Design a protein around this ligand. Structure first.
Ligand SMILES: CS(=O)(=O)NCC1CCNCC1
Length: 185
């Protein structure tokens, strides 16, 4: 792809994080802690899942960023509306304000309703995410496989400002402790 020139510097918003997440000093990495991280509760925190938002809000234009997922067994990545539900159980779908893909149990899927199987021959170590606000497009790229296309959501109805979205996943297995990292431009 040729989207690299729309690169934006994303940082994580601590205030939105699930209370078990540990965000690095530079706000560019996040991982699952083994306990509550001793923060107060607030209405912005995702309560049920190990999720966090980027600080940046997008309402126009073209945006691109990259995320490192090396050695993880489970994660979700994409964008979401600023006004998505934070508390309780919910599914990741465009109806609920999410445009995402995930890894789970050795398969990759797009967060449509119902979910869509992805066809990935080279497991990615870094994911590129492209958003075209005006066109209503969110696309995902396999940086490990020369930028090959993973998935395109088109005809998106964003219906609000967008924020970068992250889920580091649970670590019930002991094999999913590795962080999500925002990669340098
Ligand atoms: C390290 S772990 O992924 O196995 N923790 C699960 C907790 C389940 C109860 N709520 C917070 C998280």
């Amino acid at each position: 792809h040729h989207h690299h020139h729309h690169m934006v510097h994303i940082t994580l918003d601590r205030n939105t994080a699930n209370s078990w997440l540990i965000i690095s000093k530079d706000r560019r990495q996040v991982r699952m802690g083994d306990t509550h991280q001793n923060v107060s509760d607030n209405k912005e925190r995702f309560s049920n899942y190990p999720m966090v938002l980027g600080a940046q809000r997008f309402s126009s234009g073209k945006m691109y960023w990259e995320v490192d997922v090396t050695q993880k067994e489970a994660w979700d990545l994409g964008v979401c509306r600023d006004s998505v539900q934070r508390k309780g159980q919910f599914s990741l779908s465009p109806e609920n304000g999410f445009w995402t893909i995930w890894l789970w149990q050795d398969s990759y899927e797009a967060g449509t309703s119902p979910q869509t199987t992805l066809h990935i021959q080279v497991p990615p170590c870094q994911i590129g995410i492209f958003v075209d606000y005006e066109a209503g497009v969110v696309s995902f790229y396999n940086i490990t496989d020369h930028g090959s296309l993973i998935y395109t959501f088109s005809e998106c109805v964003f219906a609000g400002p967008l924020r970068p979205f992250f889920n580091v996943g649970f670590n019930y297995s002991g094999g999913n402790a590795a962080p999500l990292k925002l990669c340098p431009l």
